[PDB]
Scaffold this active site. Structure first.
Site, PDB file in Angstrom:
ATOM      1  N   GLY A 186       0.745  -1.247  -0.086  1.00 34.54           N
ATOM      2  CA  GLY A 186       0.052   0.035  -0.026  1.00 34.54           C
ATOM      3  C   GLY A 186       0.748   1.308  -0.017  1.00 34.54           C
ATOM      4  CG  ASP A 187       3.044   4.363   2.598  1.00 34.71           C
ATOM      5  OD1 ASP A 187       2.898   5.189   1.817  1.00 34.71           O
ATOM      6  OD2 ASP A 187       3.394   4.481   3.929  1.00 34.71           O
TER       7      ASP A 187
END
EC number: 3.1.-.-
Lengths: 151, 152
Positions: free
Chosen positions: B18-19
């Site tokens: 996600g990041d």
DNA sequence: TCAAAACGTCTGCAGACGTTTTGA
DNA sequence: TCAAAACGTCTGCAGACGTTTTGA
């Protein structure tokens, strides 16, 4: 109430902690008794080429939907019952977004009460204030004072 | 060569998906025999107000470090062996950055044989090519093609 | 010669809001 | 009078590269 496999929730908490938003808003709307709508949103963003992944969320979570806004797309969950059930289960594994998650749950549980006393509603709107403070809020207009200055 | 919980890896895999960034680079540098450095990097960014989270991570992962960039901070893991072991464990749980991860493991293994013959080295450079393509690359300059020329 | 650290760059977002409608 | 959908858009970045220096 659908129950989520604990592996899924561990992965999901990680993802949400890094690239997910938990949003609470007070929306000015004259067709409401107290003139505003309380609104809650869980949201994930992916570039539009990768939306196959946002579609899998819809399947795997079983609720919510996907929104295309040009160069980027969103997974969106707003329905209040599913959101409660979903955050309730995801909450224990959250490390960065737990507080918002809990402030959301407490707000949902008090929604019937906020529709009564203008003081209970106003107080719920201060929880909404706390959620946005925790987030990295930039463009925010309607707050609890905005509301208190109406009642 | 530390071994991680299945609960840690699952969470971490979601976070990275996600990041997180998996970066590979061909760095022009004349001190090297083939005039280029092969560089790999795992990277996560946070607002500096939330450093502690990346500091926490340094401690759980057991390796890498934290750079304060003023208003944002990075967790950075560059070391080849720790990098291999970390990605080898995390790789089966990734749903988005898995391809990058595999290409990175591929590269780390062929690394010593890449230093021996400019043709193996050029092949390895075609792997960083592939990783850049899987990312949202925008400012890239040194590719395998600029390596091919130079090696002539 | 090399692995690894250190430091520099930027513009296309994108997290987090906004306002209005739909359909009860 | 409400829950939810639908759609519009700002500003501080920050993903993913770059170049340079360190020290065995």
């Amino acid at each position: 109430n659908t129950k989520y496999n604990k592996e899924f929730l561990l992965y999901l908490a990680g993802f949400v902690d890094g690239d997910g938003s938990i949003i609470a808003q007070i929306k000015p709307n004259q067709s409401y008794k107290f003139k505003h709508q309380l609104s809650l949103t869980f949201q994930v963003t992916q570039k539009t080429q990768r939306r196959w992944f946002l579609d899998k969320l819809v399947d795997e979570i079983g609720v919510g939907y996907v929104r295309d806004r040009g160069s980027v797309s969103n997974y969106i969950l707003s329905e209040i019952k599913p959101l409660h059930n979903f955050l309730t289960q995801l909450q224990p594994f959250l490390k960065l977004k737990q507080k918002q998650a809990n402030l959301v749950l407490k707000i949902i549980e008090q929604l019937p009460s906020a529709k009564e006393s203008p003081d209970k509603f106003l107080e719920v709107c201060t929880w909404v204030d706390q959620i946005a403070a925790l987030n990295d809020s930039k463009t925010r207009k309607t707050t609890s004072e905005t509301v208190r200055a109406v009642l």
